[PDB]
Design a protein around this nucleic acid. Structure first.
Ligand SMILES: Nc1ccn([C@H]2C[C@H](O)[C@@H](COP(=O)(O)OP(=O)(O)OP(=O)(O)O)O2)c(=O)n1
Ligand SMILES: OC[C@H]1O[C@@](CO)(O[C@H]2O[C@H](CO)[C@@H](O)[C@H](O)[C@H]2O)[C@@H](O)[C@@H]1O
Ligand SMILES: OC[C@H]1O[C@@](CO)(O[C@H]2O[C@H](CO)[C@@H](O)[C@H](O)[C@H]2O)[C@@H](O)[C@@H]1O
Ligand SMILES: [Mg+2]
Length: 580
DNA sequence: GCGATCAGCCC
DNA sequence: GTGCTGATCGCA
């Protein structure tokens, strides 16, 4: 039964009520400078469809969009806000975002369109976007009659679903999480994405030619050491060369065949000179194809900026993710790849990059939630946590901690957070389970509070069916009762790790909101560019660095109040690389 | 063209 | 523990 609506040729006062479900459709996955194909509005007066060229040129409509007293309910308001920013139009007054609401109610549903959200409440009078637009090479905007009905049905669903979703969020004690954290954050991310990050393409291109030369030398050497040419980028062909022609021992296999992972190769290095060159080739090739060519592909030719898109409704822990490009995995550990960061520069002359990062926020959060006396005292003394853990599990004085002992203690600390397992640790430390388990038992002996938390949180997950973070983010764990050991164990690790990683996510999100407000009150030109899980990257006039050195760490350290202090380190320079 | 595999980068 | 990307491969 078709849905009734007015396919308007002009904008009327009736369409500008102070409460409405609004749809500003952007079909392209990457919404930066992308087309708005249609508009739909549903309010107390009816349902309307408006052509973009018409509405967006209407002075009254544009004013309505930018009036914060005129409330709008939408799905993925950031997409619409950014597409509008590229057209010089401000979107204000978004009081409800169905995507973010659905995300908070259950991140596991993977809601990515209105239909999926509506299905959560048995509402099915709307089609999935993929059904209307198709996918891949077949993707396409349908004729006006089909498009208009779809957009109106989406607006209609949003209009109907707002109350039931808000009611459930309220029952879950998550309504403030939506209204005071995620929605305000959505507007901040929109600003960051739109601003973009300036890239020194000349610098990137120069590095690219250096690697092209280095890869050519190592490539030929590999063929030389192998006695023939083959596709190194082919694990299949590489395996034949290594485990058949050169007879290297098979230490590990994959579902399909021989493993050629870096971890395995390192062990085979002693047997043949070719292995070292394969490792080098893998290093250079990764930088060339992924960080040089891949980054250059998404830089905008006119402005030389990259405009990432932060997916705010994807991770099961509350973290943000980044795409096109993913600016959350730019090399830094290895010096060769770290140089890539010299390519990210300030967008204005005489401006600099400022970066601030939380120091061990996950372990501090664990100290707080577990109320472990030993761990809390360690952070109150601001001790090197890995050295301290080594002293405790190995029963030695600070002076007796060797470099290897600290390395292994650090591995134990990472596991503890990321759901400890006498299997993942061993594999990571190149040791056995019995041994790894011995380290774990020693850890819990030194940190009994953490042991109690791990036991209690798993019990809570089983009883309630989910675990929660500091700001009430939730994650359901139905597999916690599984009779399959591996399936159940993974759920148990999630029960232990989500409150830690998730609370850390809550904190940095609140810090971003607090910082944006402080920068405005202070009348500073500085602004946020990126977020990388536990760090914030900004750019600003060189004349504002001194003020930022005091302001940013303070705002981040005071975002929330825990049983232990929060610590923030900071640096600034002419490029992202120098902000070290 | 498209999806399963493999690999490797970040926190 | 959470993510995103690129080169191969054989399939359609
Ligand atoms: N109705 C609610 C209540 C809480 N929360 C989430 C976000 C809040 O920041 C957090 C803590 O809620 P509290 O009830 O503890 O309120 P505050 O912690 O904000 O106030 P108080 O200092 O009284 O604890 O839980 C929410 O989303 N919706
Ligand atoms: O606008 C981002 C928002 O849209 C979703 C779908 O509702 O993801 C789409 O857009 C992303 C950005 O280009 C793509 O990575 C993704 O593949 C596409 O489906 C949400 O997941 C996201 O929160
Ligand atoms: O010269 C291209 C040609 O070489 C092969 C093997 O001889 O692959 C080599 O070059 C590719 C492009 O740089 C790499 O991806 C690959 O790892 C390297 O061995 C052929 O497959 C290709 O047609
Ligand atoms: Mg850090």
């Amino acid at each position: 039964a078709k849905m009734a609506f007015t396919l308007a040729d002009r904008v009327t006062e009736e369409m500008l009520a102070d409460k409405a479900a609004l749809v500003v459709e952007v079909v392209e996955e990457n919404y930066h400078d992308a087309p708005i194909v249609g508009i739909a509005v549903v309010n107390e007066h009816g349902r309307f469809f408006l052509r973009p060229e018409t509405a967006l040129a209407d002075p009254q409509f544009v004013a309505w969009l930018g009036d914060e007293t005129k409330k709008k309910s939408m799905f993925d308001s950031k997409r619409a806000a950014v597409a509008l920013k590229w057209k010089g139009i401000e979107l204000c007054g978004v009081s409800f975002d169905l995507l973010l609401a659905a995300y908070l109610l259950d991140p596991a549903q993977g809601v990515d369109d209105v239909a999926a959200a509506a299905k959560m409440k048995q509402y099915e009078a709307v089609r999935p976007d993929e059904a209307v637009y198709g996918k891949g090479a077949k993707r396409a905007v349908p004729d006006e009659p089909v498009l208009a009905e779809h957009l109106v049905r989406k607006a209609a669903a949003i209009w109907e679903l707002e109350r039931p979703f808000l009611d459930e969020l309220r029952r879950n004690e998550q309504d403030r999480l939506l209204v005071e954290l995620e929605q305000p954050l959505s507007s901040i991310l929109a600003e960051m994405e739109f601003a973009g990050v300036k890239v020194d393409t000349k610098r990137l291109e120069q590095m690219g030619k250096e690697l092209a030369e280095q890869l050519g030398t190592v490539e030929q050497r590999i063929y030389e050491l192998a006695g023939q040419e083959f596709n190194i980028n082919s694990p299949k062909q590489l395996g034949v060369i290594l485990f058949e022609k050169l007879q290297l021992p098979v230490l590990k296999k994959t579902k399909t065949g021989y493993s050629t992972s870096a971890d395995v190769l390192e062990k085979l290095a002693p047997y043949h000179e070719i292995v070292e060159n394969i490792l080098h080739y893998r290093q250079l090739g990764k930088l060339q194809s992924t960080y040089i060519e891949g980054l250059l592909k998404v830089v905008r030719p006119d402005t030389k900026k990259v405009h990432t898109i932060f997916n705010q409704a994807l991770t099961q822990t509350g973290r943000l993710s980044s795409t096109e490009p993913n600016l959350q995995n730019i090399p830094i550990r290895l010096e060769e790849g770290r140089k890539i960061r010299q390519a990210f520069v300030p967008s204005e002359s005489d401006w600099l990059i400022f970066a601030a990062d939380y120091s061990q926020i996950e372990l501090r959060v664990l100290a707080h939630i577990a109320e472990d006396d030993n761990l809390m005292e360690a952070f109150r003394r601001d001790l090197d946590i890995h050295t301290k853990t080594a002293m405790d599990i190995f029963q030695v004085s600070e002076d007796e901690v060797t470099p290897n002992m600290r390395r292994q203690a650090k591995a134990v600390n990472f596991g503890i957070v990321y759901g400890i397992s006498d299997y993942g640790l061993a594999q990571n430390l190149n040791i056995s389970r019995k041994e790894a388990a011995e380290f774990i038992e020693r850890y819990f002996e030194s940190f009994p509070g953490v042991k109690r938390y791990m036991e209690n949180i798993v019990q809570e997950a089983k009883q309630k069916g989910y675990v929660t973070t500091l700001l009430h983010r939730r994650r359901y764990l139905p597999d916690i009762t599984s009779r399959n050991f591996n399936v159940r164990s993974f759920a148990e690790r999630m029960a232990m790790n989500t409150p830690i990683q998730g609370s850390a996510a809550d904190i940095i999100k609140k810090a971003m909101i607090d910082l944006n407000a402080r920068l405005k009150e202070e009348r500073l030109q500085a602004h946020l560019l990126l977020q990388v899980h536990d760090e914030l990257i900004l750019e600003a006039p060189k004349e504002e660095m001194e003020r930022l050195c005091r302001l940013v760490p303070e705002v981040m350290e005071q975002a929330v109040t825990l049983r232990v202090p929060l610590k923030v380190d900071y640096h600034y320079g002419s490029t992202w690389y120098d902000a070290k």
